[PDB]
């Protein structure tokens, strides 16, 4: 989507994997600012917004 | 039949009481950190922050 338009979906009652997120070299950055890449496989969360 | 006639000790007992209360009760306090609980802050953190 455009940039005024940014796209926005909510994920809700799923298991995820971050790691296979986190390891793969595809992406060019990758900041996380509220906590660490690493821990994420270990919290749970509810109502994600990407 | 009077009562409220030893408002000395019952005094002290309430200064120490309310002393101790707010000692425990200041320790939920945030003091400029992101929470106040150091299990959550430990496992959501790289050490160096």
Redesign the interface.
């Given at each position: 989507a455009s940039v005024y338009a940014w796209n926005r979906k909510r994920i809700s009652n799923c298991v995820a994997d971050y790691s296979v997120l986190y390891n793969s070299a595809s992406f060019s950055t990758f900041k996380c600012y509220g906590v660490s890449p690493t821990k994420l496989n270990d919290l749970c969360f509810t109502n994600v917004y990407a | 039949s009077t009562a409220s006639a030893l408002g000395k000790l019952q005094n002290v007992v309430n200064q120490n009481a309310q002393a101790l209360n707010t000692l425990v009760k200041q320790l939920s306090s945030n003091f400029g950190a992101?929470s106040s609980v150091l299990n959550d802050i430990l496992?959501?953190?790289?050490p160096p922050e």
């Open positions: - | 992101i496992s959501r953190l790289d």
